[PDB]
Amino acid sequence: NPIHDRTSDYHKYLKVKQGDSDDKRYIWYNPDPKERDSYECGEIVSETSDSFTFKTSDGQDRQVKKDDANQRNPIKFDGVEDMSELSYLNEPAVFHNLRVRYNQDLIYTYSGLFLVAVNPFKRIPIYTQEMVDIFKGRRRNEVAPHIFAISDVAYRSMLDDRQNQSLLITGESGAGKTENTKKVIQYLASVAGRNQGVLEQQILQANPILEAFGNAKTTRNNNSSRFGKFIEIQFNNAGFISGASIQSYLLEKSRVVFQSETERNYHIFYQLLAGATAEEKKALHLAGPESFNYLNQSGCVDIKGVSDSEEFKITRQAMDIVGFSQEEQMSIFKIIAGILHLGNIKFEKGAGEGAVLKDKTALNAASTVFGVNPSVLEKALMEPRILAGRDLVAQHLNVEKSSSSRDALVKALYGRLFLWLVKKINNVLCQERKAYFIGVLDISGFEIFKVNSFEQLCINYTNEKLQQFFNHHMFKLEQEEYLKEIDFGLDSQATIDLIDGRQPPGILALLDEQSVFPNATDNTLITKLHSHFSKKNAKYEEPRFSKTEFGVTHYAGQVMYEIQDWLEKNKDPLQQDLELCFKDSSDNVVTKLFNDPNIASRANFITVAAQYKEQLASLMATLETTNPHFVRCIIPNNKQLPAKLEDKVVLDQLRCNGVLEGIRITRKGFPNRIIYADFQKATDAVLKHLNIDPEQFRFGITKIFFRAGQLARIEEARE
Ligand SMILES: Nc1ncnc2c1ncn2[C@@H]1O[C@H](COP(=O)(O)OP(=O)(O)O)[C@@H](O)[C@H]1O
Ligand SMILES: [Mg+2]
Numbered sequence: 001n002p003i004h005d006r007t008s009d010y011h012k013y014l015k016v017k018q019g020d021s022d023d024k025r026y027i028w029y030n031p032d033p034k035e036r037d038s039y040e041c042g043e044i045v046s047e048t049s050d051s052f053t054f055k056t057s058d059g060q061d062r063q064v065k066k067d068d069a070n071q072r073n074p075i076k077f078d079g080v081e082d083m084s085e086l087s088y089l090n091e092p093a094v095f096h097n098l099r100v101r102y103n104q105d106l107i108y109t110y111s112g113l114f115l116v117a118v119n120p121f122k123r124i125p126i127y128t129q130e131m132v133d134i135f136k137g138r139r140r141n142e143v144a145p146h147i148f149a150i151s152d153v154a155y156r157s158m159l160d161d162r163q164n165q166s167l168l169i170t171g172e173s174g175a176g177k178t179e180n181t182k183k184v185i186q187y188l189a190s191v192a193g194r195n196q197g198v199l200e201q202q203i204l205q206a207n208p209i210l211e212a213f214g215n216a217k218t219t220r221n222n223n224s225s226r227f228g229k230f231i232e233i234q235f236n237n238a239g240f241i242s243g244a245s246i247q248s249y250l251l252e253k254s255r256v257v258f259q260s261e262t263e264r265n266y267h268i269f270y271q272l273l274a275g276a277t278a279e280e281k282k283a284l285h286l287a288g289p290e291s292f293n294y295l296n297q298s299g300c301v302d303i304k305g306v307s308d309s310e311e312f313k314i315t316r317q318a319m320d321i322v323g324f325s326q327e328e329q330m331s332i333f334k335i336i337a338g339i340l341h342l343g344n345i346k347f348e349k350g351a352g353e354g355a356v357l358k359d360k361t362a363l364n365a366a367s368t369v370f371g372v373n374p375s376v377l378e379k380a381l382m383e384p385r386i387l388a389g390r391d392l393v394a395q396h397l398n399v400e401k402s403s404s405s406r407d408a409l410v411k412a413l414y415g416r417l418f419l420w421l422v423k424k425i426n427n428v429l430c431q432e433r434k435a436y437f438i439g440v441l442d443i444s445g446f447e448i449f450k451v452n453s454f455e456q457l458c459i460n461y462t463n464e465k466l467q468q469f470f471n472h473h474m475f476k477l478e479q480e481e482y483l484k485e486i487d488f489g490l491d492s493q494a495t496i497d498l499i500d501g502r503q504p505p506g507i508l509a510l511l512d513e514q515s516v517f518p519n520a521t522d523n524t525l526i527t528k529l530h531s532h533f534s535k536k537n538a539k540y541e542e543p544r545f546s547k548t549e550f551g552v553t554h555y556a557g558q559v560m561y562e563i564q565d566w567l568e569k570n571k572d573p574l575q576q577d578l579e580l581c582f583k584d585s586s587d588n589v590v591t592k593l594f595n596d597p598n599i600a601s602r603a604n605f606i607t608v609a610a611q612y613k614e615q616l617a618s619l620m621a622t623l624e625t626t627n628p629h630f631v632r633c634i635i636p637n638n639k640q641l642p643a644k645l646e647d648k649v650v651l652d653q654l655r656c657n658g659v660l661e662g663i664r665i666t667r668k669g670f671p672n673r674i675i676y677a678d679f680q681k682a683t684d685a686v687l688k689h690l691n692i693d694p695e696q697f698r699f700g701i702t703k704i705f706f707r708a709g710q711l712a713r714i715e716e717a718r719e
Contacts, residue, residue, distance in 0.1 A: 002134050003143065010134055013126050014144035016079040016104060023716065026072035027054050028092035029062065037648045039092040041072055072096075074715045081145055082110040084672035087712030089663050091651055102636070102645050108145035111632075111659050112666050113474065115150050118634045118650075119176040122642040127183055132190045147180050150629050151187045154438055157627055159239045165438040166626035168466065170445040171633035171657065174221035174640065180631060181231070181442040182207060188233050188438065193241045199429070203233075203244045205318040206425050212271060212315040213418055214251060217264040220638070222303045226252040226266070227418070228443030228459075230619060234434035243431030248422050249443065249615065250458060253411040257343065259298040266414075267311065269295055270302075272336050275312025284337040285365045294343035294410075323428050331589040334369045335417050339410050341366035347382070347399040347406075355382050355402040371586025380577040381406055405575055412574050413582075416593040416600065423599070439626065441619075446556045446656050454569045457507070457561055458612050460554055461499045465620055467555050467658055468492035473628060474662070478669060495554060498539045500613055504532070507552075508609040515570045515607055526550065526563050556656035570607045632657050667708060674704035679715070690714065 002008035006018060028039035042054035045061065053063035073088040079100045080086065086093055094111070101109055102118050109116045126146065135148040137156065143149055154165040167184055169177050185204070193200040211223065218224040228249035236242040259265050273289050280286070289295035302308075319329055341362045350356025357363060357378055367374040382402050385394045397405065446463045447456050468489035475488050499506050505513065510532060514525045529550055534542035541551030541558065551560045582594040594600045602611050634653050636645040654660045666672065679686065680702055687697050690710065698705035 002130070003138075009125065009128075009130070010144075013105065013124060014146060016081075016101070016106065023718075025713075027052065028070040028072055028090070028096070029054060029056065029064075031057060035648075037091075037651045039070070039647075071712070074712055076715055079104065079106070082112070082672070083116075083663065084110065084112045084666060087708045089667050089708070091654070091660060094654065094660070094663065095647060095651060098634075098650070099645060106145075108147065110140070110145055111663060112672060113470075114630045114632050114659055114662065115145065115147065116632050116634060116659060117147065117171075117176055117180055118636050118645065119174070119179075120642055121636065121640060121644075127186070129190075132187055135187070136191060147183050147631065148187050150631065151184045152191070154627075154629050155188065155191060155239075158235065158436055158438060161627065162436070164436055164626040166623050166628045167438070167440045167631060168470075168623075168628055169440065169442050169631040169633060170463070170466070172220075172445060172447070172635050172653065173218065173224060175633035175635040175653075177442050177444075177633050178223070178225050180633060181229075181440055184440050185231065185233065189241065192235065192239055199243065200241065202322055203241070203429055205321040206244070206246065206429065208314050208318040209322065209421065209425070210246070210248070212268040212311070213266055213421060214248070216255060216259075216266050217300065217303050219260065219262055220635075221640075222306070223267075225442065226255055228462075229441075230622075231440040231442070233438045233440065234431045235436045235438070236433075237435040242434050244429040245426055245431075245437075246422055246429075247619075248418065250455060250612075251415055251418050252455070253415045256339065256414045257294060257407045257410055261298050262300045263298050264300055264303065265295055265298075267308075268315070268336060269340070270308040271312035271315060272333055274308035275316070276333075280333070284333070284369060285341070286337060292340050292343060294340060322425055324424070328424075328589060331587055332417070332421075334371075334587065335413060335589065338366050338370040339413055341369065342406055342410050345381075345406055347402040349399050353398045354396045355399040357382065370582070370590055372581055372590070373584070376577070376581045376584075380575055380581045381409075384575040384577045405578070408574050409578055413593065417589075419599050420589070420592060439622065441623075445632075446554060446559075448557070448559050448656075452559055452561045453564070454561075454566050454608075456559070457499070457552075458609075460552075460559060461496070461612075462616055462619075464492055464495050464499070464555055465616060468496065469620065469623060469628070470630060470658060470662070474665075474669075478671075481671060492555060494537075495539050495552065498533065498537055498552065508613060511566055511570055511609055512607050515567055520567055522548065522563050522565065522567065525566060529563075555658070570609055572602075572608050632659055670698075670705050670708065673698070673706045673708060674700065675706055676702065676704060678704075678706075690717075 234243040344362035347355035471488035533540035
């Protein structure tokens with residue numbers, strides 16, 4: 001028994017070591033108030049009903065107020081598995097426990113409802129079959145923190161409550177959302193699939209494929225997910241996997257035509273370029289990424305510790321497993337290839353405010369591979385017909401404009417293709433006969449970058465709703481766990497409203513209004529916003545100086561956004577003639593992408609914001625029907641290094657994500673101040689022996705709710 005077997009890897013890697021043997025007061029102080037996050041521990045030389053006085057590291061005293069005191073929990077608490085047990089809940093205290101664990105390579109910790117996960121940035125052998133095996137049917141409290149644990153508890157709850165389940169895994173980029181997501185899947189595939197089982201493999205083989213097309217190297221992660229996802233794992237009434245469905249969100253289509261220095265475009269481009277046969281290449285009029293605009297710009301065409309070649313095998317291999325037809329494949333690759341050619345096209349001004357395509361090279365390559373007609377692509381690109389009254393005139397675009405349309409084309413295609421891959425995969429995996437499901441959400445948390453644009457507002461709106469769901473969930477519990485004699489998600493409402501309100505109209509509604517609109521510009525747009533909200537809506541901020549930015553007070557703080565391009569982004573335009581050109585494609589796949597309203601169109605067309613709000617609401621509607629579980633993935637630093645947990649990087653995250661918030665209530669909100677077993681009837685004996693004060697202690701029903709007080713003096717007592 002590994003749980004019992006202290007030699008087991010289980011014990012080693014998942015537990016704080018058991019050294020079986022069977023008067024002071026510290027604080028976390030900051031030797032630099034300018035460094036709110038760089039504490040030190042100091043001893044309290046004494047108190048005063050009003051304050052505390054300790055001893056700096058230097059051993060040269062200072063003195064704060066009790067009510068300002070970041071008291072250090074007793075050392076015995078150092079490494080506890082759930083922050084719900086700490087006496088002292090305060091930032092540094094919290095950090096300190098995470099740290100102590102992280103230092104022992106214990107990346108998982110609970111904080112009440114939350115599973116906190118700190119990326120280790122190195123391999124930790126804990127996702128082995130043996131490891132799976134150990135987690136089966138065990139309660140959270142019976143085994144070490146782990147993503148398998150949460151996964152198991154959701155699976156049991158599902159079988160026991162006959163209720164759908166959900167797992168919400170969020171956090172910043174490179175924090176390990178995706179890692180944890182796969183493990184959830186893996187564990188589920190193991191504990192509930194076929195042993196002595198094809199659907200499972202298929203279900204598994206779907207992630208590699210989506211990753212090839214939707215992930216990429218960024219400066220924060222070598223395999224960034226450039227789309228959000230919701231994985232519905234489907235079970236029959238017996239508790240075995242019947243199927244699966246994937247919902248994707250906000251693919252970063254722009255990355256196809258532009259990548260920052262050092263980053264890469266999507267994986268697949270490289271894999272394709274480096275994995276194709278000497279024969280498909282030329283067949284594909286292919287060449288090296290060096291020779292490709294969309295791949296020659298960032299200075300990076302490689303990922304260290306990565307073989308595009310080998311990875312291409314997989315993708316392919318996976319394609320076969322799921323079921324893509326060889327031709328479907330080729331076609332899928334033709335698109336990629338196609339896309340590459342288009343990036344190669346070069347518009348020059350050949351006479352006067354008009355682009356000319358002097359070199360028909362790249363054009364031919366694109367077309368040929370797209371199975372479209374060189375002549376109309378061209379005309380669709382450089383001279384699209386534009387409706388101007390009754391009039392449908394062909395319009396000659398300059399060079400700039402011509403390129404952007406070309407880019408718009410590249411993006412729809414990429415975007416469209418992804419859309420298709422997802423459906424096609426669903427076709428193969430999906431079951432609406434399902435009894436139940438366990439859904440896993442893998443998407444970024446709040447995002448505050450150097451520059452925040454329309455995409456960040458969306459992500460942050462979602463986060464705003466996810467956090468209110470958490471808060472509400474959390475009050476339900478309390479409320480219900482009180483069948484006897486403070487709604488928290490009400491607090492997220494104003495922000496939510498500012499963004500999505502209808503009347504008065506919020507940011508999105510104003511944006512939509514402007515997108516139809518005649519006098520349509522980024523400047524009219526930003527003016528309307530301040531006009532409606534500056535000094536008028538408490539969650540809004542008009543900048544002292546920028547004329548192109550605005551601030552929203554989000555849950556996790558203010559985020560300044562920039563409006564450049566919102567109108568275009570909201571409309572996501574694509575020249576219809578261009579729609580026309582492709583509509584008539586030789587390719588069977590290309591045709592779908594342009595002929596299938598379900599693919600080639602948004603839902604009388606709605607805008608991007610409108611589509612986003614909707615898919616957000618649908619998502620939430622779904623969640624509301626589940627028993628949710630919460631996973632907060634934490635990045636330990638910004639260097640992609642193990643062993644380096646920087647205070648500041650960490651505390652920021654615990655404030656944004658709501659572990660910290662969620663916690664502080666965990667002071668008042670003292671359920672988990674239930675030491676059913678403690679140092680029941682003599683459990684007042686003790687209180688009566690040490691004669692502690694009534695109303696710091698609490699008698700539940702054999703259960704409990706003790707005091708985050710004497711409790712933290714009530715342990716290193718000599719008796
Ligand atoms: N449990 C884990 N063990 C090892 N590496 C991990 C773990 N979680 C994340 N990582 C590391 O971080 C990198 C990025 O993590 P990832 O799951 O992709 O984050 P996210 O999806 O949150 O952007 C991984 O590819 C890996 O190197
Ligand atoms: Mg990811």
